[PDB]
Amino acid sequence: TDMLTLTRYVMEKGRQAKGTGELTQLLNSMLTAIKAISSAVRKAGLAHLYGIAGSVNVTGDEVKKLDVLSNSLVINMLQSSYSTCVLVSEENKDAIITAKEKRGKYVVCFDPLDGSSNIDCLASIGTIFAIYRKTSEDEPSEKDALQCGRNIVAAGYALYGSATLVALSTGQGVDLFMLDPALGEFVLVEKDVKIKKKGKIYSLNEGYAKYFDAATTEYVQKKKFPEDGSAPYGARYVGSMVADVHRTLVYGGIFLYPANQKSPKGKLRLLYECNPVAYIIEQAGGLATTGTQPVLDVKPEAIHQRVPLILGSPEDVQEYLTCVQKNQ
Amino acid sequence: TDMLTLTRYVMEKGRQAKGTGELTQLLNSMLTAIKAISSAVRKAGLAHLYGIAGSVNVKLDVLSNSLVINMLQSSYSTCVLVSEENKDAIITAKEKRGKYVVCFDPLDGSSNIDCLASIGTIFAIYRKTSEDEPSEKDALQCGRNIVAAGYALYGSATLVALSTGQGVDLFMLDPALGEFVLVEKDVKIKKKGKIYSLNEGYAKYFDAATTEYVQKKKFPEDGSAPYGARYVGSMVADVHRTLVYGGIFLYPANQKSPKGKLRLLYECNPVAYIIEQAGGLATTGTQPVLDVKPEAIHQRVPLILGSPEDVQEYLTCVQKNQ
Amino acid sequence: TDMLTLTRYVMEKGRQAKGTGELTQLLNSMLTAIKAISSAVRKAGLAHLYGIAGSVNVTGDEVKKLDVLSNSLVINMLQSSYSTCVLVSEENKDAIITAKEKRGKYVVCFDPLDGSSNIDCLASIGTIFAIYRKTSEDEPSEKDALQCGRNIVAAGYALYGSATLVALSTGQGVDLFMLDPALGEFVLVEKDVKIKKKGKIYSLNEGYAKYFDAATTEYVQKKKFPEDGSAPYGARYVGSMVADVHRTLVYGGIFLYPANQKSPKGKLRLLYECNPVAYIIEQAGGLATTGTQPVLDVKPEAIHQRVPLILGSPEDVQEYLTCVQKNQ
Amino acid sequence: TDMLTLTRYVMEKGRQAKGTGELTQLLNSMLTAIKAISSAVRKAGLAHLYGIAGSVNVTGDEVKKLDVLSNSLVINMLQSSYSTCVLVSEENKDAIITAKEKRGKYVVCFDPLDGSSNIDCLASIGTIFAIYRKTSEDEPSEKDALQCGRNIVAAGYALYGSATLVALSTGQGVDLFMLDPALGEFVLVEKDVKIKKKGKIYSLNEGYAKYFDAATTEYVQKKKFPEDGSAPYGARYVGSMVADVHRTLVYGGIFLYPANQKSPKGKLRLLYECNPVAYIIEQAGGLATTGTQPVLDVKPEAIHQRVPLILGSPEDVQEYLTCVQKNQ
Ligand SMILES: COc1ccc(-c2ccc(S(=O)(=O)NC(=O)Nc3ncc(Br)s3)s2)cc1
Ligand SMILES: COc1ccc(-c2ccc(S(=O)(=O)NC(=O)Nc3ncc(Br)s3)s2)cc1
Ligand SMILES: COc1ccc(-c2ccc(S(=O)(=O)NC(=O)Nc3ncc(Br)s3)s2)cc1
Ligand SMILES: COc1ccc(-c2ccc(S(=O)(=O)NC(=O)Nc3ncc(Br)s3)s2)cc1
Ligand SMILES: O=P(O)(O)OC[C@H]1O[C@@](CO)(OP(=O)(O)O)[C@@H](O)[C@@H]1O
Ligand SMILES: O=P(O)(O)OC[C@H]1O[C@@](CO)(OP(=O)(O)O)[C@@H](O)[C@@H]1O
Ligand SMILES: O=P(O)(O)OC[C@H]1O[C@@](CO)(OP(=O)(O)O)[C@@H](O)[C@@H]1O
Ligand SMILES: O=P(O)(O)OC[C@H]1O[C@@](CO)(OP(=O)(O)O)[C@@H](O)[C@@H]1O
Known about the structure:
Four copies of one chain form a homotetramer.
Chain A: H1 6-16, H2 22-41, H3 46-49, H4 62-79, E1 84-89, E2 96-97, E3 106-114, E4 125-133, E5 154-160, E6 164-169, E7 174-180, E8 185-193, E9 201-203, H5 214-224, E10 234-235, H6 241-251, E11 254-257, H7 270-283, E12 287-289, E13 309-312, H8 314-326
Parallel strand pairs in A: 1-3, 9-10, 9-11
Antiparallel strand pairs in A: 1-2, 3-4, 4-5, 5-6, 6-7, 7-8, 11-13, 12-13
Bound molecules: ligand 96G (4 copies) and 2,6-di-O-phosphono-beta-D-fructofuranose (4 copies).
């Protein structure tokens, strides 16, 4: 059949639904920021920083330059879309209220550059976003960003890995897109991706083992020493949530950042890290839990609230929930 | 100061050493293969595979291998190639024969290709020392005889680490220029890091020394905080992190891989060379990796490398358990 | 103010006009084809043709491969847009009727790779297009493409020169966009371009001088030997219509391909060469004539009809038309 | 055969000639400047000038920014090569003497961005250079650049057209290289190009016709009104010397910028425009004359000296020279 780019694919869906165009305009702007971020992440123009024309400007805090630039690309592209009223960024203490003359109907929570500890060693990094409609009748404020994940209008992520990929869901499953750098556009590469029912990879930072609860300690023990005669799982932990979650999506398995003694509410952020990937994984037939309730059912209380995160193949998450139940 | 590209930087060193030019020509060809691999890894031209011009035809391991073999053979600098991808050694035709042997993994971290995690290219270069006809025995030199070694990391950006025996230099591909820019000269690994890197899914197959060492990283005996864990699943990605952040990377023997998994010629020796050139250690647990005398081109060996105090602590666990 | 990409700019206009989305979707597909042509024109992937991976495949005819590739890119992207019913291409003898299941309401006339004699010497080349609404109630046929240029819905061109530019008009002047290759998208760089009233450059192939009519001969002589102490015009003739016309738009002056004894009907094509650039030049405040009437007023009679073309700064075209009347 | 990049192709020649490597290092540095120029010419990063991250920085004079940037790229890359002692640039009034600690043995005359009047309309532009060995025993001075073109060690040009090409000669014919933007390297596409004995294209600015001498007037008249039953020549004048000269090389024909009443010594510059392309055209078996002697034999007297230029296919230049003798 036909070769489809992301914005054409979105336009076709927004037209058949006879929508206003505002979501399409918002998403198109986000992808323009994503292309710009990807180009900077891949180090376009670096020779000019190192004095090819005689002006040396070597960068000191490259995680700071890149997350500051990323944040500006996303904020500027979204505000200029005329589609937004409230933005929440991993990089900003307070919610960002769109100027009245550019105001639209959507709230966007995003991490402009996820996996910052991987910037200097060049491992995979990413951008994560979740989109809500403003539902309150009042003035736009940070309370409009405090909806639970079941109300997501669209969510997705960009992975700046060995290639640049976008996963996107509007409520009808997960579609994958690859950036063709020679074309400059995202090509639709996989429709309605479905996670494996059960995987063979478990993904978590085991340096927190002395702080784990008993259920987490038990679950990891089962992965290494199956009570079963089956082979133990392989372990993977890239250290970028977007990279590890995407691997979980396309290979199956489980990803965990549980609460521990030093992080009793988890580390990952509910609004702009856990909810979007929980939405993506569940749309693909997976599960996402805090260990006591579904992530998407949590009512947020603060825009930078933390939550434990366990997600992936449904059977793997189910075994983890059983470990939680068995340990009180 | 001046902006230096990789090939200019190598040319100046090869000139001041008054060498024949053959190493420079080999390296320039390898870098051309790496640029081509990087472009393919980033999926340039993917829209034509998906029918933008009307021909739908929806591989990377094979292409990388052909890119490296063709660029190396066409350099006129090679006599024997050993690739992760070929059962036998590849002898260069006489009209293209030069004096160097190259061992390479054209695309390391192959289980990470489909999930778009970091992958890489690894290589080690030797001079042919035998007087006979070129054969695979020319590739069986131990890592002490490396002329040059390095790797390409196709991660969030494309980087090359390179050593010719005088430390490790790092270069970044500026995709708008099309050339690798020198970004750091003579990198030194930290004495001690705070990250440990290995596949803990083999925990039931570990020997006691590995088991004890992993336990010490999680439950330190000295009130200090436990190490963080990272395991990308690509040796090149994990080793390069070890180089620039410090810490330790391990693929020890286990019950199912009693001589290890990683390959001595084109995986362990090149990264062992790099890590030692940066002031770190690389051991099999009983001797330095670079001292292992190869016996077959696809020989496996255990690999533990990184910051020297961390490797020293692992060796203490090895000895404490015999 | 805001940084706008072509598709963002078009969506905004299509929203405020409350359209169905079909033109925006058509244009979006055309721009994807143009980006793909631009990448091939700049020779992306040439190293693989010359055997970098061991497969040598040097093209014996560069001009044949590129216009065949260009033609396929445009046809495939337009048909796949679901916006077209009839295509007229410089490369196809008959009109191309879209398959029934992909039919939309628009007719597109295009030259996919104009300036073919400049391909092997690497001078500027381009893509030209004009868009019409289907007017018949019947089955689509080539009669839907035989409308005169006054009925153009949208027209423009891509110039693959020292950089890649698109000029576009939907009836409210001419806008210029530049392709940022590091971003992969066209950026709006100039709104509502206006041609100079009078220029100082004349552009025509004087190797046909022995075939010119008397008026053309007189006009050219006036440009070299002015009778009013003013300096003679400079001459430029790139040999690619898109390049020479675009210089005319942004620098002023006149471009001519008049009838001559060997081309008594002119050389350039009415549907997908003369009408589109006539539309652009008039939208910018210039004139476009065949020497007896405005180009946009000619009623097409066959899809590959030729017509004389004189266009550019209004005062220059008028001096030429004065020469035409003066010589009967 | 094998896929050869420019720097590999040069290294192999420099090895078999067992030279010091200094010329190779110089050329490699020059190609880096050319790659950087091509990227800027194609407008990489333009979206950041137009505020994609919120920082608008639209440039007023585009021809001023690009030729200043070009000039800086060439000067810095060449000086940093440690291969140069004297540089002459179209953009600098005085010769540029390399600092003592970076001094090498070569003198470089270059036009970093030829065809500047074509920058804003996106027609083809280029870079021209000629390399000489310092032969004086004295201190480096501009006199080291005043050698005549017979003493050229290497010369060539970059054409930033529909694709980027480099023409290069070290004295054994002309080789052509194309920049593959996906690889970032120049691929050898044609070895030892030879110009046609006689062409069918003539190329000059006929807007100076009232200022031509009699021989030029007669030669142009013969091209349009042949007295021997042959067809008249076609005319082309891009307006960028590199583009017009390169077309002359690969298609045949003639390019002329003769002296005229307003430019009694010609317009084009001997050191960094006429000598380099004269070298290229002669290496390919063509001719390059001032109308009274071969261009390569003129002994320069000032670094910015002008000279008339007539070059191309030998039979075409000879017909021009016959007109010069015929008019005294
Ligand atoms: C049932 O699955 C789906 C999937 C996707 C969607 C949607 C995507 C975008 C929207 S939208 O609200 O922004 N509307 C529009 O974009 N309209 C337009 N008019 C003209 C043009 Br051109 S685009 S709805 C709806 C349902
Ligand atoms: C002491 O640290 C080092 C580091 C690197 C090297 C080397 C790199 C390449 C070589 S080489 O053998 O290929 N010779 C050359 O390339 N010669 C040349 N002539 C002209 C040109 Br232009 S390059 S030696 C030597 C010593
Ligand atoms: C007065 O000057 C102008 C200039 C341009 C236009 C037009 C451009 C495209 C069209 S259209 O017909 O395709 N419809 C739409 O694009 N609808 C949409 N809805 C939502 C989204 Br998001 S796009 S109309 C109209 C008038
Ligand atoms: C017979 O026609 C020709 C054509 C070209 C040339 C030349 C090109 C460059 C030079 S050079 O002087 O710079 N020396 C070198 O490059 N030496 C090197 N050694 C090792 C490496 Br690796 S490069 S000579 C000579 C003769
Ligand atoms: O180092 P630990 O504690 O494992 O945290 C890793 C997690 O933190 C994040 C949060 O963004 O990365 P980082 O702190 O490196 O920015 C996630 O990408 C990653 O999953
Ligand atoms: O899956 P496990 O056994 O951890 O092996 C991972 C190791 O194997 C290698 C060997 O190439 O990758 P892979 O099998 O994924 O291609 C190394 O890059 C990586 O470090
Ligand atoms: O060679 P002449 O007759 O001047 O033709 C020039 C005209 O023909 C065209 C027709 O497309 O070029 P070409 O045949 O070289 O592709 C126009 O771009 C150009 O304006
Ligand atoms: O406008 P005219 O006088 O024809 O000058 C054209 C010549 O001048 C040059 C000199 O660099 O261009 P320009 O003045 O446009 O920079 C040559 O490229 C071109 O051949």
